[PDB]
Design an enzyme around this catalytic site. Structure first.
Site, PDB file in Angstrom:
ATOM      1  N   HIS A 118      46.390  47.793  39.172  1.00  0.00           N
ATOM      2  CA  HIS A 118      46.207  47.585  37.740  1.00  0.00           C
ATOM      3  C   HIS A 118      47.446  48.134  36.987  1.00  0.00           C
ATOM      4  O   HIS A 118      48.197  48.980  37.452  1.00  0.00           O
ATOM      5  CB  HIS A 118      45.035  48.432  37.222  1.00  0.00           C
ATOM      6  CG  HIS A 118      43.716  48.223  37.875  1.00  0.00           C
ATOM      7  ND1 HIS A 118      43.001  47.050  37.786  1.00  0.00           N
ATOM      8  CD2 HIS A 118      42.961  49.039  38.629  1.00  0.00           C
ATOM      9  CE1 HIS A 118      41.869  47.120  38.442  1.00  0.00           C
ATOM     10  NE2 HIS A 118      41.802  48.332  38.975  1.00  0.00           N
ATOM     11  N   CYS A 139      45.210  44.738  31.231  1.00  0.00           N
ATOM     12  CA  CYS A 139      45.785  44.829  32.572  1.00  0.00           C
ATOM     13  C   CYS A 139      46.427  43.454  32.840  1.00  0.00           C
ATOM     14  O   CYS A 139      45.745  42.436  32.656  1.00  0.00           O
ATOM     15  CB  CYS A 139      44.655  45.092  33.577  1.00  0.00           C
ATOM     16  SG  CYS A 139      45.255  44.887  35.272  1.00  0.00           S
ATOM     17  N   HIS A 165      44.752  41.428  35.945  1.00  0.00           N
ATOM     18  CA  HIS A 165      43.375  41.035  35.691  1.00  0.00           C
ATOM     19  C   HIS A 165      43.063  40.620  34.280  1.00  0.00           C
ATOM     20  O   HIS A 165      41.880  40.556  33.886  1.00  0.00           O
ATOM     21  CB  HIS A 165      42.475  42.262  36.060  1.00  0.00           C
ATOM     22  CG  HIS A 165      42.630  42.573  37.533  1.00  0.00           C
ATOM     23  ND1 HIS A 165      43.004  43.804  37.994  1.00  0.00           N
ATOM     24  CD2 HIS A 165      42.464  41.763  38.620  1.00  0.00           C
ATOM     25  CE1 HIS A 165      43.082  43.759  39.317  1.00  0.00           C
ATOM     26  NE2 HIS A 165      42.746  42.535  39.719  1.00  0.00           N
ATOM     27  N   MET A 194      39.869  41.944  31.785  1.00  0.00           N
ATOM     28  CA  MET A 194      40.171  43.403  31.824  1.00  0.00           C
ATOM     29  C   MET A 194      41.070  43.788  30.643  1.00  0.00           C
ATOM     30  O   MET A 194      42.306  43.883  30.695  1.00  0.00           O
ATOM     31  CB  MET A 194      40.809  43.750  33.158  1.00  0.00           C
ATOM     32  CG  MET A 194      40.934  45.273  33.329  1.00  0.00           C
ATOM     33  SD  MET A 194      41.129  45.736  35.079  1.00  0.00           S
ATOM     34  CE  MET A 194      41.227  47.525  34.804  1.00  0.00           C
TER      35      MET A 194
HETATM   36 CU   LIG Z   1      43.551  45.533  36.462  1.00  0.00          CU
END
Ligand SMILES: [Cu+2]
Length: 91
Positions: free
Chosen positions: A39, A76, A79, A84
């Site tokens: 991440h 992120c 993601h 996210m």
């Molecule tokens: Cu992430």
């Protein structure tokens, strides 16, 4: 003070936990790699508070100090497509 935000939720979801947090101007936010790495954290409009480098290992932490009141959206990159995204409100 320093508040922690988990990257990857304890229930397995691709999310920051807590997804919305309110802090005071001058407080430090610490992100902690929890599950489903890698991440990263990009704070919209704020390159100086962002951490573009990926975090791969569980427990890896990085921080940012928010000195200006306001609402900040962050996400992120790997993601973002899965939702996210988080919010920090600085009082
Ligand atoms: Cu992430």
């Amino acid at each position: 003070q320093t508040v922690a935000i988990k990257m990857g939720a304890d229930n397995g979801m691709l999310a920051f936990e807590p997804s919305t947090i309110e802090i005071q101007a001058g407080d430090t936010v610490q992100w902690v790699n929890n599950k489903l790495a890698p991440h990263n954290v990009v704070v919209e409009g704020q390159p100086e508070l962002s951490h573009k480098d990926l975090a791969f290992s569980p427990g890896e932490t990085f921080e940012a100090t928010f000195s200006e009141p306001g609402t900040y959206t962050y996400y992120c990159e790997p993601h973002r497509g899965a939702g996210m995204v988080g919010k920090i409100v600085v009082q």
